[PDB]
Design a protein around this ligand. Structure first.
Ligand code: PRO
Ligand code: PRO
Ligand code: PRO
Length: 583
């Protein structure tokens, strides 16, 4: 797969809208800190050429590689912000270390303003210049989530655009889109969290880890497929994900559309559930597929024991072709159990392997593994006690109150982890309870255990930037499969030494009165954590006390005429009230 020109080939195979979309998405992801203007300049230029090259392919440079042009028209034209302690230098170096540099400056927590949707303003920018508006949703998003799966972002930018198109005619604009962009915002964050797991697997964990996940995912959705065609899909689908993580975004997309086609040529041996998706346009297509409902468990399927427990050849197979035998086990197990979460299924493929390892060198392997499946059914007991026990706590306290309980756990579990992180993480776990505890339990486990896999991974990439807690590095590093369990076990690090007391961590101002509900809670929960870090041993009761006083006090002072003065006047009292009172 070489061409007269890679760029003209991508431009033809993608068109202008998506071409530009992805190109801007690349830059926004490299240079997360340059404003949107500069970006669109550069997109037009490589958009310039692509036409030049559809026009005449033999033209000077039409032949260079994609890293090349992206580099030259990013680097030598405007050597943007050397200030980046990272970026300045790669510039002058060539193929392909220069691009290799570029990628590795990606920042996973770039701390730009969190934008809160204001309808009247938003509707307006949509009326002013509908295409900029769409470009800025890309730049804004992509720049916050430098590993967002690019094609899937385009499809999201067009959805957002369909909401403004539907809603701005209305008289209460708000009651129209706010909701619609709310539940959409979630979809996009889960999308981001899910492709960072992919990327982080391929890198800390080997690409084989990626294929295993995918192999479970697809064997539930296409339960009626052969193992060979599942492996064929998981094969190319991984190349897709591979490129996207690798920044070959354009390659990534063209390649995702082929796989979508291929999937539609064979929709027959795949599922009688893909025909909607298989005549939709390009991107709707790929989004639809990935998300299609799990086909029906085929009829009259052999017991699993037939090949994984009674067959005599088990140990031979395991020894002659380990991966093969095991992928097959994974397929055969997943297509029979859609109610299971991909995360759990892998712990089970892993456990079955542990058992083989063990018995295949005992003297009578079959007596040892013959009962394996009865064992396996029970490993699911834990992740379901866990979810049950955490849901009750949630329905009890409701969301905020759940979050606040998770804050005490996780702070006690990893006190060395920075406060924004304990706050961020602690808030997403909380939410899973909102997202899942009402689900039928045939969708629950999947729900719950899937998200936890995404939230923990977030935990992991924040932490491994600035490692501080050893237990966490362990949980993050040992087995991708056992992470959730690992972290759940964490007990209070008895190694920890208290933060020294500090009035600013409990100083409060009258902004609390006025901020949105999210900013208000993050404020309070940020205090909780610091309270913990400074007294880790502290009894839950002592905390309730302490939170209770903070609350009453935010009230007495938010009802005041002069709100700030209040905060200046009783503030101390509440400080003092905290230190000696619950010392
Ligand atoms: O025009 C070409 O040569 C490309 C290479 C793969 C098939 N078509
Ligand atoms: O149904 C059958 O024929 C196979 C034989 C082993 C287990 N099930
Ligand atoms: O705030 C209090 O009550 C304690 C007493 C001495 C130092 N601070």
């Amino acid at each position: 797969d070489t061409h007269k020109s890679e760029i003209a080939h991508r431009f033809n195979d993608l068109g202008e809208e998506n071409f530009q979309g992805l190109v801007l998405i690349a830059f926004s992801q490299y240079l997360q800190q340059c404003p949107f203007d500069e970006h669109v300049k550069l997109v037009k230029e490589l958009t310039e050429f692509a036409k030049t090259c559809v026009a005449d392919e033999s033209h000077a440079g039409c032949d260079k590689s994609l890293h090349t042009l992206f580099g030259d028209e990013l680097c030598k034209v405007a050597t943007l912000r050397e200030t980046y302690g990272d970026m300045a230098d790669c510039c002058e170096k060539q193929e392909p270390e220069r691009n290799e540099c570029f990628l590795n400056h990606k920042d996973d927590s770039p701390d730009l303003p969190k934008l809160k949707p204001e309808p009247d303003t938003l509707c307006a920018e949509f009326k002013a210049d509908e295409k900029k508006f769409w470009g800025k949703y890309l730049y804004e998003v992509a720049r916050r989530h430098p590993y967002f799966y690019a094609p899937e972002l385009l499809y999201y930018a067009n959805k957002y655009n369909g909401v403004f198109q539907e809603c701005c005619q209305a008289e209460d604009k708000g009651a129209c889109l706010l909701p619609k962009i709310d539940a959409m915002r979630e979809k996009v964050l889960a999308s981001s969290a899910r492709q960072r797991l992919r990327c982080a697997s391929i890198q800390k964990f080997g690409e084989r880890a990626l294929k295993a996940w995918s192999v479970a995912r697809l064997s539930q959705k296409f339960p009626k497929a052969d193992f060979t065609d599942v492996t064929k899909i998981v094969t190319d689908l991984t190349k897709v994900h591979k490129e996207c993580c690798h920044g070959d975004l354009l390659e990534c997309a063209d390649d995702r559309a082929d796989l979508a086609k291929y999937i539609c040529d064979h929709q027959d041996a795949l599922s009688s559930k893909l025909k909607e998706c298989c005549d939709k346009p390009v991107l709707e297509k790929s989004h639809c597929i990935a998300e299609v409902d799990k086909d029906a468990v085929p009829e009259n399927l052999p017991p699993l024991t037939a090949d994984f427990a009674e067959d005599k050849e088990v140990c031979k197979n395991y020894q002659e072709a380990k991966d093969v035998f095991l992928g097959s086990f994974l397929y055969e197990y997943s297509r029979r159990h859609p109610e299971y979460a991909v995360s759990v299924l892998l712990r089970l493929a892993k456990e079955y392997e542990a058992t083989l390892e063990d018995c295949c060198a005992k003297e009578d392997p079959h007596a040892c593994y013959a009962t394996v499946f009865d064992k396996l059914k029970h490993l699911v007991d834990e992740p379901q006690n866990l979810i049950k026990k955490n849901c009750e706590l949630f329905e009890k306290h409701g969301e905020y109150g759940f979050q606040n309980a998770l804050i005490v756990r996780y702070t006690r579990k990893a006190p060395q982890v920075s406060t924004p992180t304990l706050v961020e993480i602690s808030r997403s776990l909380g939410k899973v309870g909102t997202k899942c505890c009402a689900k039928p339990e045939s969708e629950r486990m999947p729900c719950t255990e899937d998200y936890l896999s995404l939230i923990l991974n977030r935990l992991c990439v924040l932490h491994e930037k600035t490692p501080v807690s050893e237990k966490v590095t362990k949980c993050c590093t040992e087995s991708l499969v056992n992470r959730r369990p690992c972290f759940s076990d964490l007990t209070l690090d008895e190694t920890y030494v208290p933060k020294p007391f500090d009035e600013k961590f409990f100083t409060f101002h009258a902004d609390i009165c006025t901020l949105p509900d999210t900013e208000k809670q993050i404020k309070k929960q940020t205090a909780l954590v610091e309270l913990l870090k400074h007294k880790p041993k502290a009894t839950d009761e002592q905390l309730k006390t302490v939170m209770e006083n903070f609350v009453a006090f935010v009230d007495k002072c938010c009802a005041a005429d002069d709100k700030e003065g209040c905060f200046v006047l009783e503030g101390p009292k509440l400080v003092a009230s905290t230190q000696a009172a619950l010392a």
